[PDB]
């Protein structure tokens, strides 16, 4: 591994403990805000807090994220080296071939 690992660890600790410091500073009353009341109705929050649950819910969350969006992510990664490349015009189907009377 690289020698920059402790640097990244320090920065990670920075962001984590600063978010925790903010959460301590603002104190109670977070449940009365609109952010919490909207997150209660937000499926992203449901998924994110179900991921860490026990009973295989980590596997469920990972596999669900994969099946839904990770396939599009694989396609996106495949398409990074396709956007810059010269491609021909799309031979749009003339929708003439295939029709045949029944008998």
């Amino acid at each position: 591994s690289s020698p920059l690992v402790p640097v990244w660890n320090d920065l990670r600790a920075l962001q984590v403990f600063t978010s925790q410091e903010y959460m301590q500073k603002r104190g109670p009353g977070f449940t009365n805000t609109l952010e919490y009341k909207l997150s209660c109705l937000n499926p992203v929050k449901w998924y994110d807090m179900m991921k860490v649950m026990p009973g295989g819910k980590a596997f469920v969350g990972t596999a669900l994220g994969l099946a839904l969006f990770g396939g599009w992510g694989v396609e996106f990664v495949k398409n990074i080296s396709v956007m810059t490349k010269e491609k021909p015009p799309i031979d749009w189907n003339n929708e003439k071939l295939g029709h045949l009377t029944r008998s």
Partner: protein, 274 residues
Amino acid sequence: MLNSNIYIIIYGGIIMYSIMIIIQMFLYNFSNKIYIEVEINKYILSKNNIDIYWIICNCTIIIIITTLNHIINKIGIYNMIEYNICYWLIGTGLGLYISPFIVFGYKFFVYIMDLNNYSLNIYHNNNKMNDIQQIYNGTNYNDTMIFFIKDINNIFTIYRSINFFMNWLYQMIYYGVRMWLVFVLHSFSLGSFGELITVITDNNLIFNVFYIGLLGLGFILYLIVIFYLGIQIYVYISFSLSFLHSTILLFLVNYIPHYNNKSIFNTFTNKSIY
């Protein structure tokens, strides 16, 4: 016809050459058993030790057997089999690669699927906000508007979970390729020097004689070959297991100290209170 999709496979001498590799295992009788016992007990302590041990033993003895069949029993496949890359990557390396995942696959899978929920690991985590962040938001880190890129995040997080299982694959491939290169290049170089010597002596028949001796040169080359290839096989096995330790088995270090029991002949129960 259109529906006929034809494939050509290649086939050669496989059956009778693979049968004797297994029949020899009764003669060797796992002579490598003590070495792998020592090394496995050096590198890990668990109930599932014997499992991984058996795996390695089988793998290792097969390698050893093939090597001797490659050195002595020279017929058909036994000559090529150590000069082929498919044998060194799939016939030796893949089994050793998948052995810990087949023995400790439950724990590794649970670990991997938990690491997709990426979070900062705190030692002596007596913090309270850490728990709320891990449950409510899912991670210690700020996950705000990362769903916006979830399509990549998922797959990237998947690699983030297996990145510390990847150097094992790299070392397996590297040492398979190393053994292949070693065998091939040394055989080729030795044969090339021999052929050059034969060209020097065939054009000068005063030297086209058994000048070193019928057995002297042969005995010396036998010793050289066996010493070198035994050193290389020992290197392969020992380094493969040391890297197995340093790459896959340090995850499973769970030392439990012994705590003395006191309430042996009496146990508190739900009926003691309720």
